[PDB]
Design a protein around this ligand. Sequence first.
Ligand SMILES: OC[C@H]1O[C@@](CO)(O[C@H]2O[C@H](CO)[C@@H](O)[C@H](O)[C@H]2O)[C@@H](O)[C@@H]1O
Ligand SMILES: OC[C@H]1O[C@@](CO)(O[C@H]2O[C@H](CO)[C@@H](O)[C@H](O)[C@H]2O)[C@@H](O)[C@@H]1O
Ligand SMILES: OC[C@H]1O[C@@](CO)(O[C@H]2O[C@H](CO)[C@@H](O)[C@H](O)[C@H]2O)[C@@H](O)[C@@H]1O
Ligand code: NO2
Ligand code: NO2
Ligand code: NO2
Ligand code: CU
Ligand code: CU
Ligand code: CU
Ligand code: CU
Ligand code: CU
Ligand code: CU
Lengths: 334, 334, 334
Amino acid sequence: DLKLPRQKVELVAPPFVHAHEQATKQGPKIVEFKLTIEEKKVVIDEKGTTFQAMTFNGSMPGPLMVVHEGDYVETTLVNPATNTMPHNIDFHSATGALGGGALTLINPGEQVVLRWKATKTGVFVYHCAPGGPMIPWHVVSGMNGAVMVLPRDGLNDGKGHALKYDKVYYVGEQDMYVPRDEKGNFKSYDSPGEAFTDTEEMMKKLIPSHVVFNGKVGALTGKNALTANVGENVLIVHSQANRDSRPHLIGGHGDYVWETGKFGNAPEVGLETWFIRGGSAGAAMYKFMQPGIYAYVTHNLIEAADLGATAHFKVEGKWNDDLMTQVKAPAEIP
Amino acid sequence: DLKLPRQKVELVAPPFVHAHEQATKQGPKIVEFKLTIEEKKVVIDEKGTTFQAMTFNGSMPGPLMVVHEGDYVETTLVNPATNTMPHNIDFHSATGALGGGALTLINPGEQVVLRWKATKTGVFVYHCAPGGPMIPWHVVSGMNGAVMVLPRDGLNDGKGHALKYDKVYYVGEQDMYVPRDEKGNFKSYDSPGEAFTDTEEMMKKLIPSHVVFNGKVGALTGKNALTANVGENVLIVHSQANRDSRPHLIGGHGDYVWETGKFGNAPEVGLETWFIRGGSAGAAMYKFMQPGIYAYVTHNLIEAADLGATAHFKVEGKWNDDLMTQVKAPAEIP
Amino acid sequence: DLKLPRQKVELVAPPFVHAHEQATKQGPKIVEFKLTIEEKKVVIDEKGTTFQAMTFNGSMPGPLMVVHEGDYVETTLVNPATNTMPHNIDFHSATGALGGGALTLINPGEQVVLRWKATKTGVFVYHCAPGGPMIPWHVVSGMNGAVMVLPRDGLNDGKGHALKYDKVYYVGEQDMYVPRDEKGNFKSYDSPGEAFTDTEEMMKKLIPSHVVFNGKVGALTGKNALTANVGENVLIVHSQANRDSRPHLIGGHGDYVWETGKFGNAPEVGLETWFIRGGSAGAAMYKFMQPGIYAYVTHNLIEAADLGATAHFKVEGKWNDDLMTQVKAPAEIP
Ligand SMILES: OC[C@H]1O[C@@](CO)(O[C@H]2O[C@H](CO)[C@@H](O)[C@H](O)[C@H]2O)[C@@H](O)[C@@H]1O
Ligand SMILES: OC[C@H]1O[C@@](CO)(O[C@H]2O[C@H](CO)[C@@H](O)[C@H](O)[C@H]2O)[C@@H](O)[C@@H]1O
Ligand SMILES: OC[C@H]1O[C@@](CO)(O[C@H]2O[C@H](CO)[C@@H](O)[C@H](O)[C@H]2O)[C@@H](O)[C@@H]1O
Ligand SMILES: O=N[O-]
Ligand SMILES: O=N[O-]
Ligand SMILES: O=N[O-]
Ligand SMILES: [Cu+2]
Ligand SMILES: [Cu+2]
Ligand SMILES: [Cu+2]
Ligand SMILES: [Cu+2]
Ligand SMILES: [Cu+2]
Ligand SMILES: [Cu+2]
């Protein structure tokens, strides 16, 4: 019925994003994506705490999918027989059938193919949502990512000027609920099913044990710091499928920010901290002015420093003494 | 002194809203409303947990009051002798005297009549606020609702175009604090006064036991699902008098959203999830494009699925395969 | 190198703000400020609970610094030898070096001088951030304040009209974490270092024991109520360095509100409640229309009434019966 050109995308693991055009002369296409569910025990902190994760494509978050307004997104969702539970997918970008969830419930050993038209621009969450109490559990176990639906003319500032990024990163924040035993040590479990009772009891108290970017404390640090150069315009897409977050670039700003994440609305300018509503993605762009280390955090600083929610940028370039200078180094008080 | 026409309104129980005009050729009127306080033990979940509720007009939330900018709202507040506590009313829409609270404190057996001019457009909370520690307790016991103050020309998109809804629903979200005994079972109490000590101790820890729409788990489901048809523009007014919420229509969008709830500001467009600040009401409109079941949730999914904060819409009409289609049903992996 | 005129500012304790111009014919200057760190045990509630505070200039919050866009802000930070810990300062308004923190780490007995150019307009947090787990601890111990960077033409409504305030107040909200002993009584400690272990364990659970304005329950009440007169336009700057807040003026409104706090964006109009993201400052202006007592709260009413987060305004002037009137005083029900 639908006779449009087909284009396959090779998804890449976060925080990177598959290659795409911003402004495009292409017309609508059917863009084809594949997600393969993986349930797996992973390590989430530098002390070796383990977690029963459930993921799209083996990562937390799931990969960022990028399309343009009016494209048709055709996803093959695969639930291999090596998994234990049914799963599905719900796209906040899509219209009808609970975002697709009512059409994609698959048991281990099955796959399904869903197509939806990208009628709404912005960044959007996608997540598993099998039904009932399983919905929060699968999401907070890691089964969420995001999609970005660009205008065909690319981004603008609302005020007819184009806003072109040099690079884009996707920072998926995950609230995790790991129960503790009587000693006060984090518990380990042999299966997601076995983790369920204790994990649900903790979840209902609403306080996470960990809040992490890219699946683990320190994931986006050291060798895996985010990078930029002075003069580069970087777009940071930030999602949180269950709980609020308040992103902040320490030493920088959000030059243009869509905190509700939707490109039909003009961005706000010159923010210090912005707010990602639980169940949403937002986006912020910043042109780096200074070299050095920056930290990208949620600005609940307890969560950032003590629960895991800190990434770093390492930025190359020349220091600008007009913008900031140490007039007098630390010295004894006169 | 004030010589304007008087109009009586028959309030209706949420989620329905009393009949009103959007755009009107009427001039200012004195619009007359009556609220009768009822303290009552109610059931809040499908397991039979009870709660000592305090309500305006017998409902949680209290009913939605609808007027137009420049009307005078004249409320008779009635506290029958069958109640145990003093009560009052504070309207966020009103100016002076703590929103009216300083002029409406009434003991059991008394009534009072307050008039305020509707100078600010939008949706606003109203709530009881007797003084001191009683303020949070009365609010989280159920004593809150909302008022909607429409422009006389009706709603607009900010961009000179009219925005007319086919129907309006009021979803009042309530955070409830029910203490547990040593066993781990929810406690029942013989009076609001007897529930006070244990309830205050829990309240100060800031974690609700239940988060519900329209007073109970499952209230807006089954026979009491919200309804629409494909092609209908529905306005959903959402209030939360004490705690933040993040509304989301699963399978839909907020086509036009006033998340801070005030019609002097243009709506945002094409949202996935929006944010209702504790102590406020907001409003979102959506034109349904697909038939079927939708869930309307706060997108803290633990609260939605496990604590009570889910409503359903049942929508009639024709499925649109252009917008979404199951290209291949669940099948064994090749 | 930088040859501009120098101007010294005498900082004043919150909620007051040092004298400044709104619109100015001055060009860029180097504006000189001094902050002296003080670690001190203070009383935070009317029951006599004590707290190991860490402050800029002896106050919580630290004082508001006011400059204009394109000024250079030169701060001398002083850490006297009477303190026990290293400290630094990070300005969200500044660009590079973690907001200045990477250039201002000072041991007891040292001082440092930092200059930054005020390229971004709005209200911004400043806070200490020494590194690692110390970052949240120093902030929630009191080491935060705000700076306001005004346009040189003063404030505007976005719609070419000027917005001039008659007075400005700075309300700094502090979430505090005071542990309890087995009895259930709040603990007292002999030093910040001794309070650290118990305080960090509580902090990671994310629930404060107290939420206060200006450092203490009841600080901005009685003799220290905020004041205004009918007809006065008051700007209220509100900051929260770690945790969200939802300000509300009971009996009033936010006539013009920058809830993300940045003057490059037009204000929203006619709000009931606004939202300050943890790690940010915002600002709201209101022209008083009625005399009497107003309460300024966070509209989590449990926090406001039970945890400490209430200020009062006492307003002088003539009551306006058109806006609100008690039509019939409390009487027996007919
Ligand atoms: O940035 C979106 C914002 O900008 C405005 C102009 O104020 O419209 C621009 O963006 C639209 C969506 O990309 C374009 O269709 C339009 O042509 C362009 O002017 C606003 O209408 C919009 O909210
Ligand atoms: O939607 C409100 C938003 O729209 C604007 C136009 O951009 O003004 C419209 O709405 C006002 C309030 O209803 C009307 O008085 C006005 O005539 C109309 O253009 C904005 O000014 C406003 O913020
Ligand atoms: O209030 C800021 C908001 O107003 C606009 C006009 O809609 O610009 C005004 O404010 C700018 C910043 O102060 C001035 O430079 C400009 O000249 C003035 O019109 C918007 O552009 C801005 O977002
Ligand atoms: O599953 N580990 O690559
Ligand atoms: O009070 N029950 O209808
Ligand atoms: O330290 N007291 O003024
Ligand atoms: Cu799943
Ligand atoms: Cu969802
Ligand atoms: Cu009451
Ligand atoms: Cu209120
Ligand atoms: Cu410090
Ligand atoms: Cu900071």
